[PDB]
């Protein structure tokens, strides 16, 4: 059921943001703590829903994902002016959700009606270089629910990201995240087939003039996302990889290149059980717990891993106790069903 996968995708993103938010300033995270945290959500047997109903507040990740999906539903298509104004109005309505330090400048400029070019604020960020943050990717899952063709997913993931993220390191992260959700919607796959399809798309995109120039300017390997997708392949082939090795090779940072590949690794790794994560947890729950246990950008790596895992496993693996702990879970489910109705 594509409907189950749409609902699972947005629920998975919400879970990642809400559950991961508690650990977003830790840096290093004890898995013992994470397991206690998710256990506090489960009521006594015979009791429906959550022990902590809507107690977990979402952050900027969900606030922007909601605005992006509401824009797609309002216009039945990507509309840069509509989406930019929805981002700016959402920030204005609640500026304290936990936004990036830099991107708030973009919203303040978009709130000025003298600003007519909605892409101009993003271009001015960080001395005209653009943001390479993961804010374009944290919110992009909705693009892959609205556009079925892989060519449209790339085009509109890039344009939606460019409203805040003018660096190719920012917007190619958003494209990679959107492609992972797009692939997850196609259903059962080996890690190898999943990775090879992503590597195929990213090799082509990262050969573009802007992608080569931006990577060169930041002193990075040519085709940096492609290089990290290869590293994911190598890490999946190793018997046992420590969290320290995952973070050393892929990162757990606010940079899109240090978080989007990490999220994809978390999804692929957690297809298999882990001795440190009880078999009581399904694959979606294991992906979120493992993501958060990497520390660093815990709300954002988990929201991206959750979007992919949600699209792949669907609504059957979304636990009622976890979902109903999350602020606005019912609104999130209505948005998912609306995207399915409008676009599928
Ligand atoms: Cl690099
Ligand atoms: Mg956040
Ligand atoms: Mg974050």
Ligand with the closest atom to the CA of 228: 1
Q: How far is the CA of 165 from the centre of ligand 1 (A)?
A: 19
Which of 6, 1, 11 lies closest to 318, judged by CA? Answer: 11
Q: How far is the CA of 1 from the centre of ligand 3 (A)?
A: 31
Give the other-Cβ count within 10 Å of 44's Cβ.
6
HEC assignment per residue over the chain: CHHHHHHHHHHHHHHHHHHHHCCCCCCCCCHHHHHHHHHCCCCCCCCCCCCCCCCECCCHHHHHHHHHHHHHHHHCCCCHHHHHHHHHHHHHHCCCCCCCCCCHHHHHHHCCCCCCCCCHHHHHHHHHCCCCECHHHHCCHHHHHHCCCHHHHHHHHHHHHHCCCCCHHHHHHHHHHHHHHHHHCCCCCCHHHHHHHHHHHHHHHCCCHHHHHHHHHCCCCCCHHHHHHHHHHHHHHCCCCCHHHHHHHCCCCCEHHHCHHHHHHHHHHCCCCECCECCCCCHHHHHHHHHHHCCCCHHHHHHHHHHHHHHHHCHHHCCHHHHCCECCHHHHHHHHHHHHHHHC
Q: How far is the CA of 206 from the centre of ligand 2 (A)?
A: 27
Q: How far is the CA of 289 from the centre of ligand 3 (A)?
A: 15
Q: Is 155 exposed, middle or buried (0-12, 13-18, 19+ CB in 10 A)?
A: middle
Give the other-Cβ count within 10 Å of 197's Cβ.
17
Q: How far is the CA of 221 from the centre of ligand 1 (A)?
A: 4
Ligand with the closest atom to the CA of 257: 1
Q: Evaluate whether 208 touches 172 at the Cβ level (below 8 Å).
A: no
Q: Evaluate whether 256 touches 137 at the Cβ level (below 8 Å).
A: yes
Residue 172 phi, psi dihedral angles, 5° rounding: -70, -30
Q: How far is the CA of 246 from the centre of ligand 3 (A)?
A: 18
User: Residue 3: which domain range?
Assistant: 1-344
Q: How far is the CA of 100 from the centre of ligand 3 (A)?
A: 8
Q: How far is the CA of 193 from the centre of ligand 2 (A)?
A: 31
Give the other-Cβ count within 10 Å of 69's Cβ.
24
**Number of domains into which the chain is organized:** 1
């Amino acid at each position: 059921s594509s409907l189950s996968r749409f609902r699972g995708c947005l629920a998975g993103a919400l879970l990642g943001d809400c559950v991961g938010s508690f650990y977003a300033a830790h840096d290093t995270v004890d898995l013992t703590s994470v397991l206690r945290h998710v256990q506090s959500l489960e009521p006594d047997p015979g009791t429906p829903g959550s022990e902590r109903t809507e107690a977990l507040y979402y952050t900027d990740d969900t606030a922007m994902a909601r605005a992006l999906v509401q824009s797609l539903l309002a216009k039945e298509a990507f509309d840069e002016v509509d989406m930019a104004h929805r981002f700016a109005q959402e920030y204005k309505k609640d500026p304290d959700r936990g936004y990036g330090a830099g991107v708030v400048t973009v919203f303040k400029k978009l709130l000025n009606p003298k600003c007519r070019d909605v892409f101009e604020p993003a271009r001015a960020q960080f001395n005209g270089k653009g943001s390479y943050g993961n804010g374009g990717a944290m919110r992009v899952a909705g693009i892959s629910l609205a556009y079925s063709s892989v060519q449209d997913v790339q085009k509109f993931a890039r344009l939606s990201a460019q409203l805040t993220h003018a660096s190719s390191l920012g917007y190619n992260g958003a494209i990679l995240q959107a492609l992972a959700v797009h692939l997850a919607l196609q259903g059962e796959s080996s890690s190898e087939h999943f990775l090879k399809q992503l590597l195929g798309h990213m090799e082509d995109l990262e050969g573009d003039a802007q992608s080569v120039l931006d990577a060169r300017e930041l002193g990075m390997e040519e085709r940096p996302y492609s290089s990290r997708l290869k590293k994911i392949g190598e890490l999946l082939d190793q018997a046992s990889v420590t969290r320290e090795e995952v973070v050393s090779e892929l990162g757990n940072g606010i940079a899109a290149f240090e978080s989007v590949p990490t999220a994809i690794y978390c999804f692929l790794r957690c297809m298999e059980p882990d001795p440190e994560i009880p078999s009581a947890f399904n694959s979606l729950q294991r992906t979120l717990i493992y993501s958060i246990s990497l520390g660093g950008d815990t709300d954002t790596i988990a929201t991206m891993a959750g979007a992919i895992a949600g699209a792949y496993y669907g609504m059957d693996q979304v636990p009622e106790s976890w979902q109903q702990s999350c602020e606005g879970y019912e609104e999130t489910d209505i948005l998912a069903q609306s995207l399915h109705r409008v676009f599928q």
